[PDB]
A = this chain, B = another copy of it.
Amino acid sequence: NYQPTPEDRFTFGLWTVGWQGRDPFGDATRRALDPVETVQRLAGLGAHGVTFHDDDLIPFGSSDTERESHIKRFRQALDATGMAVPMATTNLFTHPVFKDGAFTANDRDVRRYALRKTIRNIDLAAELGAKTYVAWGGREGAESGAAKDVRVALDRMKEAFDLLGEYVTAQGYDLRFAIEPKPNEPRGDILLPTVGHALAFIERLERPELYGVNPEVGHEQMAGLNFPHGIAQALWAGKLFHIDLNGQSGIKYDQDLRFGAGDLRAAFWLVDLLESAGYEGPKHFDFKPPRTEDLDGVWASAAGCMRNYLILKERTAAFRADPEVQEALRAARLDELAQPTAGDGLTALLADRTAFEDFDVEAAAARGMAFEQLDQLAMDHLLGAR
Q: Least Cβ distance of A32 to chain B in Å?
A: 14
Is the CB of A321 closer than 8 A to any CB of chain B? no
Is the CB of A149 closer than 8 A to any CB of chain B? yes
Q: Which residues of B contact A144 (CB under 8 A)?
A: 261, 371-372, 374-375, 378
Q: Least Cβ distance of A329 to chain B in Å?
A: 7
Which residues A322-350 have CB closer than 8 A to chain B? 325, 329, 332-334, 336-342, 346, 349-350
Q: Which residues of B contact A266 (CB under 8 A)?
A: 145
The reply to whether A26 and B95 contact each other, CB–CB distance below 8 Å, is yes
The complex places the Cα of A258 from the Cα of B186 at a distance, in Å, of 17
The reply to whether A115 and B355 contact each other, CB–CB distance below 8 Å, is yes
Which residues A288-319 have CB closer than 8 A to chain B? 289-294, 296-298, 300-301, 303-304, 307-308, 311, 315, 319
The complex places the Cα of A371 from the Cα of B156 at a distance, in Å, of 19
Q: Which residues of B contact A111 (CB under 8 A)?
A: 341-342
Q: Least Cβ distance of A263 to chain B in Å?
A: 6
Name the residue among A24, A104, A115, A350 with the largest chain B CB count within 10 angstroms: A24
Q: Which residues of B contact A262 (CB under 8 A)?
A: 265
The reply to whether A26 and B194 contact each other, CB–CB distance below 8 Å, is no
Q: Which residues of B contact A156 (CB under 8 A)?
A: 337, 340-341
The residue that A342 contacts in the complex, of B120, B163, B272, B342, with Cβ under 8 A, is B163
Give the size range of A's interface with the partner: 35 or more
The residue that A261 contacts in the complex, of B21, B28, B192, B379, with Cβ under 8 A, is B379
Is the CB of A80 closer than 8 A to any CB of chain B? no
Is the CB of A255 closer than 8 A to any CB of chain B? yes
Which residues A167-205 have CB closer than 8 A to chain B? 167, 170, 183-186, 188-189, 191-201, 203-204
The residue that A337 contacts in the complex, of B104, B188, B269, B291, with Cβ under 8 A, is B104
Report the copy number of this chain in the oligomer: 4
Q: Least Cβ distance of A148 to chain B in Å?
A: 7
The reply to whether A346 and B236 contact each other, CB–CB distance below 8 Å, is no
Chain B, Cβ-Cβ closest to A144: B375
The reply to whether A349 and B143 contact each other, CB–CB distance below 8 Å, is no
Name the residue among A167, A183, A197, A359 with the largest chain B CB count within 10 angstroms: A197
The reply to whether A106 and B334 contact each other, CB–CB distance below 8 Å, is yes
Q: Least Cβ distance of A265 to chain B in Å?
A: 6
The complex places the Cα of A110 from the Cα of B364 at a distance, in Å, of 8
The complex places the Cα of A142 from the Cα of B117 at a distance, in Å, of 38
Q: Which residues of B contact A277 (CB under 8 A)?
A: 151
Q: Which residues of B contact A163 (CB under 8 A)?
A: 341-342, 346, 349
Given contacts A24-B254, A307-B380, could you give 6 more A-B pairs where the C-beta distance is less than 8 Å?
Answer: A145-B266, A147-B369, A147-B375, A152-B337, A199-B200, A311-B380
- The 14 listed contacts between A and B (C-beta, < 8 Å) are A99-B292, A100-B371, A106-B332, A107-B367, A113-B359, A144-B371, A146-B334, A151-B235, A159-B341, A188-B249, A194-B197, A196-B196, A196-B200, A200-B233
Query: Which 5 pairs, one residue from A and one from B, show the smallest C-beta to C-beta distance?
Result: A294-B368, A196-B197, A150-B232, A199-B200, A384-B384
